[PDB]
Amino acid sequence: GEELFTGVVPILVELDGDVNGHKFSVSGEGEGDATYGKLTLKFICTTGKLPVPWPTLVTTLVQCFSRYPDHMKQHDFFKSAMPEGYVQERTIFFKDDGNYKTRAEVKFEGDTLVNRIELKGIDFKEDGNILGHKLEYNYNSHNVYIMADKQKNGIKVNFKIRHNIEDGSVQLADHYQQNTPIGDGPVLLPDNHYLSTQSALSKDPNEKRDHMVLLEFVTAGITL
């Protein structure tokens, strides 16, 4: 599965969402170069205006593109599940607000790495930070904690995202994630470790559709 990521791999992302009954779709295209832990993607809201802030969707919108140091290669669950793929489920709890529940499949379709996602958001406040579009268009760096989930033959991941608001407060988004293989082939169950992630958000000055350009670098690390 690691051999599939030695070069530049095209990526396709499709999200079908519904948040407090607001339906929307997002499509994304770009490419990933896992040797450098690098992702380059452009996402479009194909249904018109996106009803939630772009930053709230970043985690949902392919951890197989992380750079795993040579010394940690035995801990790369994400690549090991390929090409058959993995199921990625989350609940994201927005503090003092609603939650997203997502289910995605990440796998190859021919040469393309595809991330197909369904998202449902419930219990959001209609003039809160999410539905009221009060989050800054930026993104902090942080560490993602990966643990084996031996019983489920997969991993559990927990992490908190802090979305900056212009008063100097943050909107917390607490993530609980599970990943399981689609195939029944062998996978790598890791020891506890983390992914250091950084994300830069931007706009295409020639793009009239509601969109997000995203550049991300991710490198694993482990404590000895």
Residue numbers in the entry: 4 to 64, 68 to 226, 228 to 231
Any passages from the paper?
EGFP is an archetypical autofluorescent protein in terms of structure and function. It comprises a core β-barrel capped at each end. Running through the centre of the barrel is a kinked helix that houses the distinctive p-hydroxybenzylidene-imidazolinone (HBI) chromophore. HBI forms as a result of covalent rearrangement of three residues resident in the central helix (Thr65-Tyr67-Gly68).
The crystal structure of EGFPA227Δ provided structural information from residues Gly4 to Leu231. Deletion of Ala227 has little impact on the general structure of S11, with residue removal accommodated by another residue contributing to the β-strand and the termini shortening by one residue. Gly228 moves into the position of Ala227 at the end of S11, with concomitant loss of the Ala227 methyl-group side chain. The additional space allows the tyrosyl group of Tyr200 to stack more tightly against the β-barrel, which in turn affects the packing of the adjacent Tyr151 tyrosyl group in β-strand S7. The result is that both tyrosine residues are now closely associated with the surface of the β-barrel structure. There is a slight shift in β-strand 7 away from β-strand 8, with a hydrogen bond between the backbone N atom of Tyr151 and the backbone O atom of Asn164 being lost. As well as the loss of a hydrogen bond, repositioning of Tyr151 shifts β-strand S7 enough to allow the side chain of His148 to exist as two conformers (see above). As a result of residues repositioning around the β-barrel, β-strands S7 and S8 are drawn apart from one another, which in turn appears to affect the stability of β-strands 7, 8 and 10, in agreement with previous findings, and is also evident from significantly increased B factors for these structures. Thus, while β-strand S11 housing the deleted residue does not undergo any significant change in structure, the repositioning of residues to compensate for Ala227 deletion results in significant propagated changes across the surface of EGFP, resulting in significant changes in β-strand placement and dynamics. However, apparent increases in flexibility around β-strands 7, 8 and 10 and the perceived change in stability do not appear to have a detrimental effect on the cellular production of EGFPA227Δ, as this is significantly enhanced compared with EGFP.
